[PDB]
Assembly symmetry: C4
Homo-oligomer: 271 residues x 4
């Protein structure tokens, strides 16, 4: 239709992208000003109305996108669904979830990631890298669970604040893995009651700092490669062979050309 | 035999793998519930029986594997031997080892690594990467030993809690390497008695944080390459030339093709 | 002109570079001696005159460069503009800027980077790598802003020293990201009032340490590649195809040569 | 000569290498036992004689090497000179150096690095990687010097324990860079007197943690490549083109073969 065509042209324009970006920045700025308790009643009401105006602009934005692209076409993108969920949750009356309150309107600033394409590409690369590290993340989970059960049984009765139950142990083991007061704060006091506690905590530190770094490097390397390959696919329109596949078959390809070259030499020498 | 053939088909099936996985998860869950001291006598007896049921299911599992594959064939795999050692140690009466107690039944959760193939491949890659870093791990050991002897002689008499003997010094040097209260907790108090102690501790920190990162990066890079190469070997059935070998001979291979190409050009120009 | 030609030859000489380097080192040494409060009035006046002599040598240096290369030619280089700004700011009477004082004459030691070419190349590579990580740096900024607004609203009234306003929260969140007393100093005291505060702080730590490492690795890898490629461009005089571009088209290039090779074989077999 | 030939064969043998290794291990073990103050007078005299026996075995070892290889040939290797310096310093009466005492006989354990070839190769790779990072190490030195001068002038009078002079400031800035109590221990107390001190310390942390990681990654990547290339050179006897040189010319080489291939196709189509 003619109506949907001119709306899509407006939506896809750089100025529309800039308008939405400016309103996200403004909404973030007013929410940051609203953290200040010393403000007057009128100053607070003024910022609250600017928050309402920002929200209504986003409702118009999303509605234009659903009309212009269609319900199936809009919800086809995970980025648009994210944008829809962020805006539509603000107008949701009494939600049945295990949450304290929906006071976190500042999560609307996270739309800068979805609206700005350079930021969208960076986050996309990271998200695409996550399934590939699932096994490493599960190994860390297994180590934490085993260690938390052991720490609860070994030290729960003598150090109940740090290890009195499974929740307490998982928390202090996270603290131990981050190396935060692990010795002066946790393990030297524990060793005053349990002298060989270093046998538990030093291998736990060695294994978890290793695994976390492995997980992080795994995500970083993959995200960087995925992003680089997606940019090339976007530039040329052709499918990009992943680098690992190029490196794995590099030897196979070179020797095959060496063979085809030597047989062409064989056909050449005798003519 | 017909009996061993249908048992191997059952063992190798995805449902059998899922049954074993569910029982490991269940056993881990009941052991985690057993860390809670507030439970009733009957609640504890109930979970203890679920632990017994889980163990008996693993005894059947392993026995089916020894019968179906043979004693030589089963113990041919390091993964099956690990599975055997984890389950068989629970039925071992009075073991002669330098251990406090075999209360750590939670180590059974480590079977999730051996049973889940994606997790098995990740750990396998890491294990295969370890011999290759042996020299770096030995260099760190040498630095720790030298430093612990020096720290004991220099500071043992004035700081006996931290350096009074070799064990105490190795422990606080591990703490110093992890950067945990190294200055406010250890070196500023030491410098009040020994003003030039920074000459010992700052180079020790520089060398050990460097070496640890070197060891960790070495393992991560190798494990990632080993895993990638093993997957390709499993997919195609052909031996995968290691990437380092492809990169080392890349120059040699390209110039050899350049030479074979130029001589084919030489045979072509004059005919 | 003959005057500008002999001045440029003098400027470009290794001895002129060594003279300037020696004066920067000397100026840095006298400023370091001037930090000592126990010095006599005459000792202080003596060093202050050596600081004046060093500054006057730099005024001559820069003036020779503007005359020899021309106003347009000198200010064409970002390195020369930096050198000009560092020296010319010392002779600036009453500047209108949001600064306490221009006592930081020690920033003149930063000229060692611009004057020594090996150091200039290293910093240049790093600077050229910065625009490419802009999106990651902006993602970290967004996470810090969102988290600081949340932390101010959640914990400002009960923990005003750490979260009483946006500035206070950004500061303690930076401290939390660096893992400095995050648990014993900040989150365990906060959890005594807000028991589920770990839900906020543990994901904040996981996301920001990850993003910072991503930003740092991104800069390091790019700077290393940019430097390596610029050296090759300087050595040969030919434009260096970036490594990513060589790796992305490696597969495309190899199969194209395989195809050209097979058709040459096809023309050869039938003659 | 016949005497030097049979001595070199003995020196180069695996058993001779194993004898020397065993004596280094033994010497290290006795020095570690000598750190214990509770030992008897006779127990101490016994270990001291085993230290003397170990030293005399090393004097024989080195003397056999100088005779068998020649003064010029032995001192041609940096590894042999290191071995000579470590052993010969023990027999040096009254040395004129800025040292407290030559009690550090435990540095003899560092010979495990020189005697064991796998360990020698690892350290060699690291040492060869150091000149290449000289510029990054100098940039960190410049940042530390500038920051130490600034910190001394800004905070020396109000925080003299941490910044009272240049030495004190360099020490606490090293502590700040390692993130050790940087905020709770140093910067929050400083900000109580100087509210904008975060403007100095947060950029200092960002720049130095970045530079240190850059220096460390630079050494790790280079050492790994140098080692891999030296092994290949040792295996084949042929000079190994560095990987960076192979990667820089990969594009140049591939297009040159594409060109030589297309002209061979041109000579083929028309015959
Ligand atoms: C092609 C990108 C890619 C991987 C990749 C990216 C960059 C790179 O340098 C190398 C590979 C990839 C492939 C396999 C992989 O395996 C890890 C094990 N998983 C299955 C638990 C991880 C990433 C991938 C990611 C998710 C699903 C499928 C493929
Ligand atoms: C040696 C090149 C390499 C990989 C590689 C090895 C052989 C091969 O034929 C192709 C590539 C590499 C790159 C990515 C990779 O991703 C898997 C990530 N996991 C942790 C999810 C694995 C190996 C690599 C490893 C670690 C960091 C950076 C690069
Ligand atoms: C082929 C895999 C491999 C190595 C490798 C893997 C990935 C990669 O990118 C490069 C190499 C390997 C080879 C040599 C090596 O030497 C270190 C020194 N050791 C002997 C102390 C380490 C790993 C290896 C591992 C153990 C034994 C033999 C070979
Ligand atoms: C530059 C590519 C490279 C290596 C390489 C260099 C030259 C060559 O011809 C082939 C590969 C590299 C990769 C692995 C490696 O493993 C040894 C691990 N040690 C620490 C056990 C060494 C170099 C590399 C080095 C560090 C991290 C990631 C990659
Ligand atoms: C050619 C160097 C380069 C990049 C590069 C360097 C080394 C390397 O191994 C790979 C690439 C480069 C290219 C793209 C890039 O994208 C990140 C996203 N930005 C746009 C936010 C970053 C660096 C680059 C840097 C700035 C502008 C343009 C190009
Ligand atoms: C796997 C090789 C690789 C990159 C690569 C992947 C595919 C390809 O065709 C070419 C190169 C790589 C290198 C640099 C890079 O820079 C982007 C930096 N961002 C974070 C600004 C991206 C990928 C890489 C990734 C992480 C660390 C080191 C190397
Ligand atoms: C060939 C090894 C090498 C370098 C290298 C090693 C591995 C790798 O992946 C890439 C290069 C090398 C080359 C240049 C370099 O420049 C840094 C700047 N210096 C001059 C301050 C560093 C290392 C080198 C080291 C010292 C002197 C000369 C060359
Ligand atoms: C992208 C491949 C690469 C380098 C590279 C880029 C282009 C090229 O043609 C060849 C190689 C790389 C490798 C080593 C290197 O060493 C310099 C070390 N400095 C810090 C002393 C520089 C770039 C690299 C960069 C960082 C980590 C691992 C690998
Ligand atoms: C990795 C996931 C980690 C999840 C950790 C368990 C959930 C949080 C548990 C918790 O907050 N408790 C309150 C204790 O004060 C214990 C509960 O079991 C009851 O409420
Ligand atoms: C991948 C690792 C993931 C670690 C996840 C940790 C979650 C456990 C934290 C939690 O749910 N708590 C109950 C919340 O009610 C525990 C904390 O409250 C407790 O540990 C202490 O902070 C003190 O309150 C008691 O000393
Ligand atoms: C890197 C391996 C580190 C091993 C460290 C030595 C073993 C543990 C020593 C220890 O616990 N002692 C008890 C001291 O309280 C000292 C013993 O020698 C006696 O029992
Ligand atoms: C690669 C690095 C590996 C470091 C290994 C450290 C092991 C040494 C620990 C040990 O065996 N102890 C004896 C156990 O009885 C020492 C601890 O007990 C002691 O250091 C303190 O914690 C206090 O108890 C005394 O102040
Ligand atoms: C990432 C950029 C972080 C910038 C942080 C805000 C600027 C510094 C704010 C500050 O120092 N204040 C003084 C409070 O003592 C608050 C002001 O708003 C008034 O002066
Ligand atoms: C990318 C992350 C960037 C973080 C940037 C932090 C800047 C905020 C610091 C600031 O401007 N302050 C006001 C300066 O007047 C705050 C500090 O003063 C305050 O947080 C405390 O240090 C105490 O003074 C109060 O308890
Ligand atoms: C990066 C190299 C760092 C070198 C640091 C200076 C040398 C040590 C200075 C020192 O120990 N002093 C004693 C102060 O107690 C100050 C001296 O100047 C006098 O002895
Ligand atoms: C690349 C970074 C290199 C940092 C190098 C630091 C060397 C400076 C240490 C030094 O020489 N001191 C004098 C030694 O006499 C200083 C210490 O003594 C002093 O800072 C404190 O520890 C206290 O003694 C006073 O509060
Ligand atoms: Na740390
Ligand atoms: Na810390
Ligand atoms: Na820390």
């Amino acid at each position: 239709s003619h109506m949907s065509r001119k709306i899509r042209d407006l939506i896809e324009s750089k100025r529309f992208q800039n308008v939405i970006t400016a309103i996200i920045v403004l909404n973030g700025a007013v929410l940051g000003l609203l953290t200040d308790t010393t403000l007057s009643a009128s100053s607070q009401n003024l910022l609250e109305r600017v928050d309402q105006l920002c929200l209504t602009i986003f409702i118009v934005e999303i509605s234009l996108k659903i009309y212009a692209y269609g319900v199936r076409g809009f919800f086809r993108s995970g980025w648009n669904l994210f944008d829809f969920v962020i805006v539509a949750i603000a107008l949701m009356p009494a939600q049945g979830s295990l949450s304290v309150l929906r006071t976190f309107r500042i999560f609307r600033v996270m739309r800068l990631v979805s609206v700005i394409p350079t930021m969208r590409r960076v986050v996309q690369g990271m998200l695409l890298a996550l399934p590939g590290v699932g096994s490493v993340a599960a190994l860390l989970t297994v180590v934490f669970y085993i260690a938390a059960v052991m720490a609860t049984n070994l030290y729960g009765a003598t150090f109940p604040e740090w290890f009195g139950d499974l929740s307490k142990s998982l928390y202090t083991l996270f603290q131990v893995m981050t190396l935060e007061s692990w010795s002066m704060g946790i393990v030297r006091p524990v060793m005053n009651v349990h002298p060989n506690a270093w046998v538990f905590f030093i291998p736990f530190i060695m294994l978890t700092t290793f695994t976390v770094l492995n997980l992080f490097i795994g995500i970083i390397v993959d995200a960087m490669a995925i992003t680089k390959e997606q940019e090339e696919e976007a530039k040329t329109g052709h499918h990009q062979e992943p680098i690992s596949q190029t490196l794995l078959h590099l030897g196979d390809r070179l020797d095959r050309i060496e063979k085809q070259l030597a047989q062409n030499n064989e056909l050449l020498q005798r003519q």
